[PDB]
């Protein structure tokens, strides 16, 4: 059998017995075949519905208990066996099981002792009976329990970011049934940025919270903080969803969606105007975004007809998410909480944003059609259909009840997108996966991302360039090194994926679905320098981390034995020139121009050998994979030599060698040389323009301002005529016009 054999039988008996009671009375016999087809989240709901009509069947109840046993849910599995046993006493083997499971999970309660006594009298002196007697004894005493707790706490003091240890603390709390403390630590720990990124931790967070909701202690205590803990569950669901989609398989991700949607439906009823309501807002968006990402995962593997229909469906999901407004940040109790919530908002808009675009670039105003066709409530049922099995009740599912009203159907603006990215760099703890994804998403756009601003958001007060550039010791790491690094990581990643699909769209993959986009070497470096800078390294591992960083420094700076293809160096050079040439301050201009000249000075010897059609000495285990896809050709050499000579002149100008800079700039009639010529002619005029000074000099001073006007006009004249020149502008067109207005009013 398969999935089709069992889900096709749905229509077989659906067409033979359609009333709800007989439809639910077939649930056990529906569930009979899903247990065989390895479907346990589905088989569970099928049997559970038959139990809703046939609540007195000992077979069905046991079958669910045996299914909860495969799910390892002891509390749920035990209860199921109990019902089957109390209905039918002749089920001896279940009395053993109950006694067997009660002693394995927790002995603190006498209920485990009681069921063991009965199990003994049903199986006099069987081999298992003693085994259970020894198991019950095993559990430690009060002093023993306190002993374990102190170890974990003393261990958590110095290792608060350890996923496993914090999990054990929740398990120890749960073993003493002081669940309020379990969630309390769970809540105070959802502020930890590292734990929030741990799949296994978030899974523990989801359980310990649900257990508390149903726990007797939650009701007795009070109903005031009930909302507070409820917020964390939704947050946990969002994080858990992001992680499950990336690592886990198609089946597990879909299953998590149902728990998410159940929570949303159970939460919306309360409403209000507090943190919980605001959280529901932002989490609502995440749901669709992840649901869209989830949709695209299935279609990727599937056929083309399903792909378009699914991508169509996903486009709507991402759209719904993007539309959701920025959550009300002021409305939260604390600074940490509100900053977190906003961070996630930026992540939602950024991820969904790029996806919305990459899907809309496929066709012309493709977005408009998506809304005009599927914004209809018919789409809501087509979405629930593709995502879920229709058998589940469509009433308590948030997806089926949401009011999809007035979808903006407006593609995102790049400027808004940039500030979403920059604000969400810390969303996924700055994993090189996160940034390499963003960097690639911007690789197809006409506006470039503010990488230098990303790094400032991550490593604060890390100097742009280190004074002690002579050595490669990693105490001298600089935001330039990182900026130079990410550029290669993305330039490398793009080429690798380009090669992959050629053998077999690359932009269209969502962030969770795609696999590692960087080499484990690169990832190891970023994780090292990150742990080092943020001061979350290990005294023992300090020396190792430190050396791991040191190894790659000499390559990021193009020093001895750099594994750098000439194309990647050139890309670094120009990418830094234009990055620096647009900066306002001199400090930053100088630095970025300096590095750009540096890399240029390293390439030109290679280009000259390449200019005469010779061979480059290939590298030894390079840090940035070489590719013949972008190997430099003679057709482009003279251009680089020219573009480099500009970068030289620019630095000469910034240092003070104006005479040589102008002499060089004027030699090449380039749009960029105008903006430089103009910018430096304007400065010679403005300073001397109004102080008392020789009249003859004043005339010469005005003469420069006249040249400034002319060069700015040449820029705009050539700019308006041709689009290719508009892209060559070292600064925005409107910025060039802005100066001109002031230049002439002077």
């Amino acid at each position, epitope marked *: 059998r398969s999935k089709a054999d069992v889900e096709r039988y749905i229509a077989s008996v659906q067409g033979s017995t359609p009333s709800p009671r007989q439809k639910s009375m077939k649930g056990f016999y529906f569930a009979k075949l899903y247990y065989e087809a390895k479907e346990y989240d589905l088989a569970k709901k099928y049997i559970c519905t038959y139990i809703n009509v046939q609540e007195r069947d000992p077979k069905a109840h046991r079958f669910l208990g045996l299914l909860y046993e495969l799910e390892e849910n002891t509390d749920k599995a035990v209860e199921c066996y109990r019902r089957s046993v109390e209905l039918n006493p002749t089920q001896k083997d279940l009395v053993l099981k109950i006694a067997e499971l009660l002693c394995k999970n927790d002995v603190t309660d006498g209920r485990a002792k009681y069921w063991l006594e009965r199990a003994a009298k049903l199986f006099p002196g069987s081999p298992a009976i003693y085994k259970l007697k020894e198991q019950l004894l095993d559990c430690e005493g009060e002093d023993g329990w306190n002993k374990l707790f102190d170890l974990i706490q003393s261990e958590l003091y110095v290792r608060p970011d350890d996923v496993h240890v914090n999990i054990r603390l929740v398990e120890v709390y749960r073993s003493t049934k002081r669940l309020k403390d379990a969630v309390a630590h769970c809540h105070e720990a959802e502020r930890n940025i590292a734990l929030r990124s741990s799949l296994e931790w978030n899974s523990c967070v989801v359980q310990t919270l649900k257990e508390y909701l149903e726990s007797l202690q939650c009701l007795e205590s009070d109903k005031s903080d009930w909302r507070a803990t409820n917020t964390d569950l939704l947050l946990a669901y969002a994080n858990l969803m992001l992680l499950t989609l990336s690592t886990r398989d198609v089946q597990e991700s879909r299953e998590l969606l149902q728990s998410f949607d159940s929570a949303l439906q159970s939460v919306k009823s309360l409403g209000g105007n507090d943190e919980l309501s605001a959280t529901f807002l932002e989490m609502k968006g995440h749901f669709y975004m992840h649901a869209g990402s989830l949709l695209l995962k299935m279609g990727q593997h599937s056929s083309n007809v399903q792909w378009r229909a699914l991508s169509e469906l996903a486009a709507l999901c991402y759209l719904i998410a993007f539309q959701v407004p920025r959550p009300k940040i002021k409305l939260i109790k604390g600074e940490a909480g509100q900053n977190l919530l906003e961070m996630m908002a930026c992540d939602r808009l950024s991820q969904s944003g790029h996806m919305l675009l990459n899907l809309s670039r496929g066709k012309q105003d493709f977005l408009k059609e998506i809304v005009e066709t599927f914004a209809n409530k018919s789409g809501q049922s087509a979405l629930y259909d593709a995502l879920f099995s229709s058998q589940s009740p469509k009433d308590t599912s948030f997806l089926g009840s949401d009011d999809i009203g007035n979808i903006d159907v407006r593609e995102p603006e790049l400027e808004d997108l940039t500030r979403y990215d920059v604000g969400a760099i810390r969303a996924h703890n700055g994993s090189l996966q996160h940034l390499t994804w963003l960097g690639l998403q911007w690789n197809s756009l006409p506006a470039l991302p503010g990488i230098r601003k990303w790094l400032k958001q991550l490593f604060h007060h890390l100097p742009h360039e280190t004074s002690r550039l002579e050595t490669n010791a990693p*105490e001298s790491i600089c935001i330039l090194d990182l900026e130079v690094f990410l550029l290669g990581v993305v330039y490398t990643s793009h080429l690798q994926l380009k090669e992959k699909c050629n053998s077999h769209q690359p932009l269209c993959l969502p962030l969770p679905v795609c696999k590692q986009l960087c080499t484990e070497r690169q990832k190891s470096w970023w994780d090292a320098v990150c742990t*080092l800078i*943020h001061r979350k390294a290990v*005294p023992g591992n300090v020396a190792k981390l430190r050396l791991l960083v040191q190894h790659e420094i000499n390559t990021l700076r193009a020093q001895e034995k750099h594994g750098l293809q000439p194309a990647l160096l050139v890309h670094w050079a120009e990418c830094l020139q234009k990055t620096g040439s647009g900066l306002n301050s001199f400090y930053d201009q100088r630095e970025y121009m300096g590095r750009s000249v540096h890399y240029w000075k390293k390439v030109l010897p290679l280009l000259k050998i390449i200019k005469k059609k010779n061979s480059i000495p290939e590298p030894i285990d390079p840090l940035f994979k070489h590719f013949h896809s972008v190997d430099i050709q003679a057709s482009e050499i003279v251009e680089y030599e020219e573009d480099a000579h500009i970068t030289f002149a620019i630095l000469d100008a910034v240092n003070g060698n104006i005479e040589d800079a102008v002499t060089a700039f004027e030699s090449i009639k380039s749009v960029v040389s105008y903006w430089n010529l103009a910018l430096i002619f304007h400065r010679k005029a403005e300073d001397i323009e109004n102080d008392a000074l020789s009249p003859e000099e004043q005339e010469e001073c005005k003469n420069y301002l006249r040249k400034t006007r002319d060069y700015l006009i040449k820029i705009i004249d050539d700019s308006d005529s041709n689009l290719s020149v508009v892209k060559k502008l070292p600064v925005p067109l409107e910025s060039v016009k802005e100066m001109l207005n002031s230049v002439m009013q002077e």
Partner: antibody
Framework: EVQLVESGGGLVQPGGSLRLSCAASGFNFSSSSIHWVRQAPGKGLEWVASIYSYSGYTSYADSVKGRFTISADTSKNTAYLQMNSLRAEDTAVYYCARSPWRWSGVSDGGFYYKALDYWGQGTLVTVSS | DIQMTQSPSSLSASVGDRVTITCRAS??????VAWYQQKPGKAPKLLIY???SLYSGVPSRFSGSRSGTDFTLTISSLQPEDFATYYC?????????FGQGTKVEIKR
């Protein structure tokens, strides 16, 4: 261009709490170990806390163990000395100082710092009801 | 616990003198000792690090030395600006301890 500035001092009642701030500039705060050294009037230097350079494992003198808490923030490029259950004996001038990773060695049984190069101006803390 | 016993507690000398201050480590300690100068009310400044290495910027008349478990600060030719209090400092495993200090008073 390189300096350490202490703040967050002032007087407080016994059994109260304070928080000192050691703001650093000019050296990469990540690779530096941060220390606090108090000095009562007419008395000598007493080491009270330390933070290993690249990770930040704490270590306190038994005279303040469990009451004080020293921390380091990379984003704010500043270290702090949280002080609780302050006693009249804690009345003293509190200095902070760094020891680079070049001078910070980890050994079996604990770590060692060769010396304290950069010191701060020193913020006064008075504890008296 | 390790202890750095500094001697003398208070010293009196005049300009040009060759002055000596000594600190004894109770347990056998490795060469991870330092020396500091603290003028009245101002901050302590580092003179010698790693027992006998001079901190950059310190005058050359300062020199550190060790003999067994006894560390010694030596000023070849005392100057008027060197009339201040001095301290010795050891760094053992996860612990730092200072000597009681030595005041250098002008003799008359």
């Amino acid at each position: 261009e390189v300096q350490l500035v202490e703040s967050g001092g002032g007087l407080v009642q016994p059994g109260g709490s304070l928080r000192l701030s050691c703001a650093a500039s000019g050296f990469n705060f990540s690779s530096s170990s941060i220390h606090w050294v108090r000095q009562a009037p007419g008395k000598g230097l007493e080491w009270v806390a330390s933070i290993y350079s690249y990770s930040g494992y704490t270590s306190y003198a038994d005279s303040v163990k469990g009451r004080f808490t020293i921390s380091a923030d990379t984003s704010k490029n500043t270290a702090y000395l949280q002080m609780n259950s302050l006693r009249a004996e804690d009345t003293a001038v509190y200095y902070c100082a760094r020891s680079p990773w070049r001078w910070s060695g980890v050994s079996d049984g604990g770590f060692y710092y060769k010396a304290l190069d950069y010191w701060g101006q020193g913020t006064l803390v008075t504890v008296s009801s | 616990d390790i202890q750095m016993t500094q001697s003398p507690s208070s010293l009196s000398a005049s300009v040009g003198d060759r002055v000596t201050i000594t600190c004894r480590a109770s347990q056998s300690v490795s060469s991870a000792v330092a020396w500091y100068q603290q003028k009245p009310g101002k901050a302590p400044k580092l003179l010698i690090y790693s027992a006998s290495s001079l901190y950059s910027g310190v005058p050359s008349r300062f020199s550190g030395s060790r003999s067994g478990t006894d560390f010694t600060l030596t000023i070849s030719s005392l100057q008027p600006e060197d009339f201040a209090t001095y301290y010795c400092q050891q760094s053992s495993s996860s612990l730092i301890t200072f000597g009681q200090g030595t005041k250098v008073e002008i003799k008359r």
